[PDB]
Amino acid sequence: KVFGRCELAAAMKRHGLDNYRGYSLGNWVCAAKFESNFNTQATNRNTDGSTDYGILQINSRWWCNDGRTPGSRNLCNIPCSALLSSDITASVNCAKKIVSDGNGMNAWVAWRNRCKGTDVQAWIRGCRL
Ligand SMILES: CC(=O)N[C@@H]1[C@@H](O)[C@H](O)[C@@H](CO)O[C@@H]1O
Ligand SMILES: [Cl-]
Ligand SMILES: [Cl-]
Ligand SMILES: [Cl-]
Ligand SMILES: [Cl-]
Ligand SMILES: [Cl-]
Numbered sequence: 846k847v848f849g850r851c852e853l854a855a856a857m858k859r860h861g862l863d864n865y866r867g868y869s870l871g872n873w874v875c876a877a878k879f880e881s882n883f884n885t886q887a888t889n890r891n892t893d894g895s896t897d898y899g900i901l902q903i904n905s906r907w908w909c910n911d912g913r914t915p916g917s918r919n920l921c922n923i924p925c926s927a928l929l930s931s932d933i934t935a936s937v938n939c940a941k942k943i944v945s946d947g948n949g950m951n952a953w954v955a956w957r958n959r960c961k962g963t964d965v966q967a968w969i970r971g972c973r974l
């Protein structure tokens with residue numbers, strides 16, 4: 846599924862990401878955009894042989910099971926295939942575990958590089974939330 850900007854903000858808000866650990870909705874929408882282009886079906890293979898899955902590009906080394914990342918963890922307790930769903934429940938519940946892991950939203954390099962210190966409120970400007 847490819848989400849509209851306002852469509853994803855409402856879903857993220859509905860699932861309780863707005864000001865989750867001090868991070869406004871704009872941060873999560875900005876991150877979605879640069880990670881996945883709002884495409885729930887986004888996969889990217891990394892040099893290390895782990896793979897990033899879904900709207901927030903969650904990594905198989907630590908967070909999910911794809912059965913082909915040797916010596917990896919499954920800290921979110923999900924098949925990585927569950928992160929590609931049009932229902933964002935699984936991605937959001939895992940994101941919550943990741944942003945609490947000590948480094949906050951720095952866990953998403955695209956966020957550090959493209960959203961951090963930006964007017965991220967621009968991403969929810971106009972939407973009925
Ligand atoms: C929180 C999280 O899993 N983010 C992932 C990161 O782990 C991975 O290294 C990167 C790919 O370079 O994609 C995302 O940023
Ligand atoms: Cl957009
Ligand atoms: Cl915001
Ligand atoms: Cl594995
Ligand atoms: Cl949803
Ligand atoms: Cl933080």
Ligand code: NA
Nearest residue numbers: 905909917918
């Ligand atoms: Na894994």
